């Protein structure tokens, strides 16, 4: 997260770290057995780490659980990043408590101007690299579709939205991918792609989760 702030331990209780011997993507817990993340975060040998704040230190409240299956959206396109969403079923159910809790799926898409909280352990520098130990947070608004399509002409499908600041300086970045964009207590976006990080006129692009709620429900129901 570039230009964000330290969330504070366990203030984002639905945030997941996907780990393969190191943190490579975020995710969001949506019930005790399932995580939503980005399809491009797919790999085998994923351990889902719940209740994390400092990802390099065991501090208490962590639950490490293996992924028993990861379901990339059947229509995910790696060149366009359209349908960049993946569901991970956990080998066993998480213990939900204060420190670990699920986030609700939306019933409606959020409108332009809705403020949202984006969180993750990704890079904090727009030029160079600096990975944080603790979870960073950023408040960012959903931008209008015409500003989004002006910023990224020909690349925004109906399954994507822009969120962030045209002035640059605050954004999600590498390592934040697959993590949550939560607006009004509902999971509205998944960190997907952008041009650089926190560059002027190049806001972040996010998977529009409200377009996938019946696919999520039907898939969880048959697996
Ligand atoms: Ca830890």
Curated annotation (Swiss-Prot):
Compartments where located: Secreted, Extracellular space
InterPro entries: Peptidase_S1_PA (IPR009003), Peptidase_S1_PA_chymotrypsin (IPR043504), Peptidase_S1A (IPR001314), Serine_Proteases_S1 (IPR050127), Trypsin_dom (IPR001254), TRYPSIN_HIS (IPR018114), TRYPSIN_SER (IPR033116)
UniProt EC number: 3.4.21.4
GO biological process, one term: digestion
Catalytic residues (UniProt): 40 (charge relay system), 84 (charge relay system), 177 (charge relay system)
Similarity field: Belongs to the peptidase S1 family.
Protein known as: Serine protease 1
